[PDB]
């Protein structure tokens with residue numbers, strides 16, 4: 001009926017999703033986290049309401065189209081409230097949403113700024129190697145082309161529970177070492193890229209009875225780890241990562257290499273970086 | 289004030305996404321379509337409420353505890369869009385149908401897509417009304433009146449303007465006949481550069497929002513065949529910002545600067561509803 005705490009004091013807005021009509025608030029009480037979510041429309045109540053004279057405020061009118069502001073009764077004004085008390089730093093860590101900034105990296109920016117910066121860090125990818133040499137997740141391999149050069153391993157994502165095709169999420173990791181990202185791609189990688197695309201899709205079809213036209217097959221520019229990997233997701237499954245600011249379709253990557261051999265070494269790639277990322281400042285400094 | 293219709297009579301629920309807190313309703317008023325969307329939370333208006341004793345109803349408890357909050361009139365806003373009159377193709381537009389992917393080669397566009405498109409597509413009168421100031425004149429954020437390289441920057445209908453979190457603006461070109469990405473050649477470079485640059489500088493002036501906070505893109509297979517550029521807040525997982533439809537303006541320009549014949553010759557990838565006749569046409573053509 002009431003708050004499990006005496007007084008709230010908003011310290012920071014952890015995360016918010018304007019799309020999902022949700023807010024995540026960190027507050028010092030008497031530390032507590034309060035989640036507020038707008039409720040989905042109930043078909044019946046909404047129908048019932050619209051079939052009666054409501055309180056409307058015409059925003060604008062344009063031809064057959066018109067927008068309004070509706071104020072419905074108490075029933076249709078429900079708000080989902082979740083309270084986390086007490087909440088530690090690790091509790092805030094999971095709901096921490098960093099401000100993203102966009103950057104346009106040219107080939108020279110990559111060569112001079114990006115490449116030396118990532119070379120300075122020792123991002124270990126031993127977990128990747130363990131997958132490839134079957135020391136880990138061997139039981140999860142859906143398909144494998146063992147070719148040391150043009151070969152790959154198709155494993156389903158760990159976040160995917162495999163109990164439905166609606167959220168089908170698979171990842172192809174190439175056997176060959178040294179292809180850190182999209183920037184390392186040249187026409188010599190075409191047989192490997194064509195296998196990941198063709199062999200991967202044919203494996204999804206055989207195993208999961210899922211046609212290629214139901215699949216979104218892409219690469220990430222500025223990937224989470226620097227050993228080439230391609231994502232196979234169900235088309236109906238929408239998620240950050242499948243967005244234009246990061247995803248690059250494999251079919252398109254292949255066709256670019258077929259047209260311009262030097263494409264990914266010379267062309268300007270667009271991606272997002274966290275505001276606090278040192279690489280962001282480095283590129284901004286370089287571009288002025 | 290009153291609705292534009294003589295009562296409502298729900299015939300079919302076109303779409304209902306519990307995730308997006310939105311409903312699409314078809315009703316006989318004559319035919320009318322009513323879209324209802326829950327509004328995103330306004331940081332201040334919510335911070336004003338929580339610092340005051342509210343009406344809560346405890347659902348569950350464990351560190352976790354769920355409640356039911358009933359806020360005042362202000363925080364109870366609902367975005368209402370009314371389409372009156374609405375056609376059969378208008379009803380088809382909001383139906384939850386399975387999506388299929390297609391890779392359209394230059395020749396597929398010329399032979400299949402272009403003639404299909406030419407057979408008929410939507411009335412774009414609302415677009416024309418914006419351009420000739422017959423509608424939404426008070427909403428224009430910037431205008432370059434050049435008949436050829438000019439445009440109009442306006443907040444899109446899908447944005448309530450009460451927060452920057454979901455900033456969605458659209459730039460519509462003044463020039464008629466550029467239906468889509470396929471019509472683009474180097475002659476359109478001044479127009480495209482003008483949208484990219486002037487559009488971003490208008491967002492900066494009006495909304496104090498830097499370009500690095502913006503995602504600027506085109507849609508392949510657009511809903512309206514009159515060239516338009518979307519300006520969205522990067523943090524917003526905007527509808528159609530996905531790789532299977534969105535094409536960054538900066539990239540569209542650079543492609544034209546490199547290959548003049550790029551969009552006439554290259555193979556474009558997009559999704560279509562399973563029930564769409566264009567989908568069958570292209571599938572039939574590709575075998």
Ligand SMILES: *S(=O)(=O)c1ccccc1COc1cccc2nc(N)nc(N)c12
Nearest residue numbers: 062065381414424442443444445446458
């Ligand atoms: S319709 O064209 O299918 C449609 C359906 C639902 C919502 C919007 C639209 C088309 O968009 C608009 C219609 C009328 C006016 C308008 N004005 C602005 N500023 N933006 C948009 N997006 C529209």
